[PDB]
Amino acid sequence: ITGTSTVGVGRGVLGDQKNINTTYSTYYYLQDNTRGNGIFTYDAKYRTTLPGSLWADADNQFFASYDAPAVDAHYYAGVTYDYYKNVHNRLSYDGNNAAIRSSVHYSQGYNNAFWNGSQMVYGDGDGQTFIPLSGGIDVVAHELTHAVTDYTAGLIYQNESGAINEAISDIFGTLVEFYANKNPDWEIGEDVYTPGISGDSLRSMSDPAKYGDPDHYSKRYTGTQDNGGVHINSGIINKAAYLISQGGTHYGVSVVGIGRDKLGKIFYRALTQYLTPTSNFSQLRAAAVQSATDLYGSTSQEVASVKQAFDAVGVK
Ligand SMILES: CCNC(=O)[C@H](CC(C)C)NP(=O)(O)CNC(=O)OCc1ccccc1
Ligand SMILES: [Ca+2]
Ligand SMILES: [Ca+2]
Ligand SMILES: [Ca+2]
Ligand SMILES: [Ca+2]
Ligand SMILES: [Zn+2]
Numbered sequence: 380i381t382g383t384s385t386v387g388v389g390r391g392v393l394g395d396q397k398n399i400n401t402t403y404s405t406y407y408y409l410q411d412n413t414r415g416n417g418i419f420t421y422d423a424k425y426r427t428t429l430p431g432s433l434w435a436d437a438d439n440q441f442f443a444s445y446d447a448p449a450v451d452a453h454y455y456a457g458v459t460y461d462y463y464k465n466v467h468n469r470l471s472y473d474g475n476n477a478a479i480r481s482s483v484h485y486s487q488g489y490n491n492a493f494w495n496g497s498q499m500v501y502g503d504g505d506g507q508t509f510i511p512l513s514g515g516i517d518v519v520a521h522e523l524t525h526a527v528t529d530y531t532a533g534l535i536y537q538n539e540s541g542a543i544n545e546a547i548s549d550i551f552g553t554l555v556e557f558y559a560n561k562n563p564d565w566e567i568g569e570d571v572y573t574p575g576i577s578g579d580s581l582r583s584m585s586d587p588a589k590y591g592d593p594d595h596y597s598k599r600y601t602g603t604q605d606n607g608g609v610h611i612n613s614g615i616i617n618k619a620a621y622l623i624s625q626g627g628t629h630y631g632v633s634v635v636g637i638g639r640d641k642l643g644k645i646f647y648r649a650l651t652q653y654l655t656p657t658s659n660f661s662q663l664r665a666a667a668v669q670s671a672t673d674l675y676g677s678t679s680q681e682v683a684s685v686k687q688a689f690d691a692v693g694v695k
Contacts, residue, residue, distance in 0.1 A: 380404050380433065384412045389441025391451040392514030393570060399453050401439055409434035409453045414460045415476030420453040423482040423500070430482045430498055448483040448511035452501055455519035456481055462520070462551075462558045463527070466640075467647050472526035479523070483513055492518055494525035508573060515570040520555035521548040532654035539659040541609035546616035547650055549584060554643045565621055584621045587614025594618045595630060596660065596693035615692050616663065620646065622688040632691035635684050645670045645685065664689040 382404030390396050400411035400418070409420035410433065423431035434449050441450050456479050463469040470476045480498035489502025492512040499522040501513040512518050525548055528534055534544035549567050557563040562570075566580035573579055580590075587594045592614030599615060600608035622629060623645070626636025645667055652673075653666035667685045675681040689695070 380408055380410060382408070382410075385439060387436070387439035387441055389446055389450040391454065392447045392511050397450065397454050399441065399450060400457065401436075403439070406435040406437060407439040408436075409449055411453065411457055414457055414464075414479075415471045416478045418453060418456045418460065418479045419481070420449050420456070421480065421482040422449065423485040425484055425487050425503075427486050429485075429495065429500065430480055431484075445484075448501060448503060448513045451511075452481040452483050452499070452513035452519060455513065455516045456499070456523060458516060458559050459520045459523045459555050462555045466554075466558070466643065469527070469647075472523060473530045481513070481519075483511065492522050494522050494529070496529070499523060499526075504571065507575065509568075510571050510574050512568075512571050515568050515572075516559055516561070517549075517552035517556045518568055518571060519552075521552035521567070524548040524551040527551070528650065531651045532658065533656040534654060534658060535656045536606055536609060538607035538609075539612070540657055541606050542612035543616055543654070543658060543660070543663050545609045545613035546620065547646065549582065549613060549617050550620045550642070550646055553584060554639060557639055565625070582610070582614065582617070584614075584617040585625070587618055592617075594692065615660065615694070619688045619692045619694065622691055623684055626684075627691075629691040630693075632687060634687040634691055635680060637681050637684050641675075641681055644674055645681070648673065660694045664694050 382402040385401045385403045387399050387401040400413050401407045402410035411418040420434050421430040422434050483501045485500045485502050488505035490504050490508045492501045503511045528544055528547055534540045565584040568581035572581050583589050592611050593599050600611045622634040624639050624642040626634050648670035649666040671682045671685045
């Protein structure tokens with residue numbers, strides 16, 4: 380909408396206070412004009428018609444329980460935008476400052492979030508498996524990263540390409556979480572997963588097997604559930620990415636860690652310059668090796684570490 384840029388204040392899903400960029404025209408709307416061609420957050424009002432209504436508020440204060448998922452979707456989309464712009468020189472998900480749209484309060488008791496091809500969508504959870512999912516910065520960045528993938532590599536959402544698609548979202552979700560630097564870890568969704576259980580998460584990148592996800596190619600799922608295991612086999616690539624950054628010895632194979640920033644550079648370059656819609660794990664290895672070669676040189680530690688990490692997870 381046309382209006383003047385304003386700054387509201389509110390509380391997120393976890394009860395933390397934050398400022399948010401809004402737009403005033405009669406109402407204060409969740410429309411952040413400070414980033415690209417805007418970040419827009421919508422109310423789906425417990426239904427499934429999208430996007431719903433652009434979030435309108437009378438006083439620019441967002442402290443109601445109903446406001447919390449909107450506050451976080453809006454704010455964390457901003458953080459994710461900043462990560463891609465500041466770290467990778469990428470302007471929004473399409474590289475041309477496309478407007479970023481999110482809807483919250485999608486459906487009832489909805490234990491998921493997704494990119495629908497045009498926008499991000501967040502359930503409120505059922506209060507047992509999840510609380511409102513936009514409360515997780517890694518979750519928000521995971522969803523926006525699907526848009527980035529779709530505009531770049533275009534990894535088909537099934538089987539190996541789909542598992543790479545998923546891992547890319549977990550990897551950049553985590554790198555965004557570290558970028559914001561509030562309780563960062565290599566776990567996925569811990570802030571909004573199972574409020575009755577402390578210390579767990581939806582997935583782990585550092586040890587995918589803690590939740591039964593594979594950490595080696597020999598343990599890959601080959602069935603048909605979950606689009607051929609896209610949220611399962613992602614563990615193999617998540618583990619490789621974790622090893623590249625942090626190092627470790629895994630099934631007897633030692634990896635020299637090179638840090639998060641270099642992991643991000645290598646995977647961003649792979650995603651945007653080398654991967655294609657049908658890339659498999661072996662092709663991802665080749666893309667990461669080539670990307671590290673471009674950035675750091677063929678004889679570099681970075682290239683050696685990429686090879687070690689894929690060796691460790693059984694991907695040749
Ligand atoms: C429970 C499994 N879900 C996830 O892993 C994350 C949310 C996590 C990070 C909390 N959500 P996601 O991977 O974006 C869900 N994917 C998904 O719904 O894709 C199917 C689809 C495909 C095309 C259009 C719309 C939906
Ligand atoms: Ca208000
Ligand atoms: Ca965390
Ligand atoms: Ca996390
Ligand atoms: Ca939990
Ligand atoms: Zn995903």
